[PDB]
């Protein structure tokens, strides 16, 4: 549209086990702050998703707390043109009617 | 093993240390707690401790007691630092029996997690006959 600049923005919501969702909300299932809240993110190994499962005893409590994260995309733009010139002389006298 | 418990009035910061375990920043000893609990190892935890031990101090000044309502009680706001040894975890049990015939090769094994590495692995046999008691398995 008009009077909104040059640029168009959008948002991308990542998704909760990955590894660009870096956020500071992670507790972990002993009620721990962690560094990640978003448990093994897009980790595969076995080991590292059994650490980080969310294990919940029949205390419940705050444990196992995530985040979650988004992104922002953007392009803009932009101007071109070109132009030739003639004269009168260079149409009419021309042996191609057809010049133009 | 018992974990010794910190407290920081000023960032709502509550450490949980080894029973030898110290801070120098201003947390005052709140208490300390049996984990995993000696009586119900599997229903509650470190939240739970730390929770139970706070409840018991005062929000004005944590260093003395008090009782509801002048107790430390919204743990929403209370941030729980993890710097004592993670618990000791049996990831891999072993089968409660295994069967085999004369002339077979037998393996075990048991993965762990936790504890402060590194690890040591210590068997041992208990024959069947009466009054049998476990003998190591000698290396």
């Known amino acids: 549209p008009?009077?909104?600049?040059?640029?168009?923005?959008?948002?991308?919501?990542?998704?909760?086990?990955?590894?660009?969702?870096?956020?500071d909300?992670?507790?972990?299932?002993?009620?721990?702050?962690?560094?990640?809240?978003?448990?093994?993110?897009?980790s595969?190994?076995?080991?590292?998703?059994?650490?980080?499962?969310?294990?919940?005893?029949?205390?419940?409590?705050?444990?196992?707390r995530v985040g979650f994260t988004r992104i922002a995309r953007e392009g803009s733009?932009?101007?071109?043109?070109?132009?030739?010139?003639?004269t009168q002389e260079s149409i009419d006298f021309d042996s191609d009617d057809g010049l133009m | 093993p018992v974990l010794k418990v910190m407290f920081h009035k000023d960032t709502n910061v509550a450490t949980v240390l080894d029973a030898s375990g110290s801070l120098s920043d201003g947390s005052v000893e709140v208490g300390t707690f049996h984990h995993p609990d000696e009586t119900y190892p599997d229903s509650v935890t470190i939240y739970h401790g730390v929770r139970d031990l706070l409840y018991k101090r005062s929000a004005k000044d944590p260093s003395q007691t008090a009782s509801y309502p002048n107790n430390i009680i919204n743990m929403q706001v209370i941030?729980?630092?993890?710097?004592?040894?993670?618990?000791?975890?049996?990831?891999?049990?072993?089968?409660?029996?295994?069967?085999?015939?004369?002339?077979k090769d037998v393996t075990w094994h048991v993965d762990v997690a936790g504890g402060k590495a590194?690890?040591?692995?210590?068997?041992?046999?208990?024959?069947?006959?009466?009054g049998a008691a476990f003998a190591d398995i000698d290396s």
Do not use: C
């Open chain 2, 118 to 130: 590194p690890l040591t692995y210590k068997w041992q046999f208990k024959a069947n006959t009466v």
């Open chain 2, 79 to 103: 941030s729980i630092d993890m710097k004592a040894t993670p618990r000791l975890i049996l990831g891999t049990a072993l089968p409660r029996v295994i069967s085999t015939i004369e002339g």
């Open chain 1, 25 to 42: 909300q992670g507790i972990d299932a002993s009620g721990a702050t962690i560094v990640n809240g978003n448990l093994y993110g897009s």
């Open chain 1, 77 to 86: 733009i932009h101007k071109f043109g070109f132009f030739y010139e003639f």
């Open chain 1, 2 to 23: 008009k009077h909104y600049g040059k640029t168009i923005k959008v948002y991308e919501y990542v998704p909760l086990l990955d590894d660009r969702n870096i956020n």
């Open chain 1, 44 to 64: 595969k190994d076995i080991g590292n998703i059994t650490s980080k499962l969310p294990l919940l005893t029949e205390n419940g409590g705050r444990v196992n």
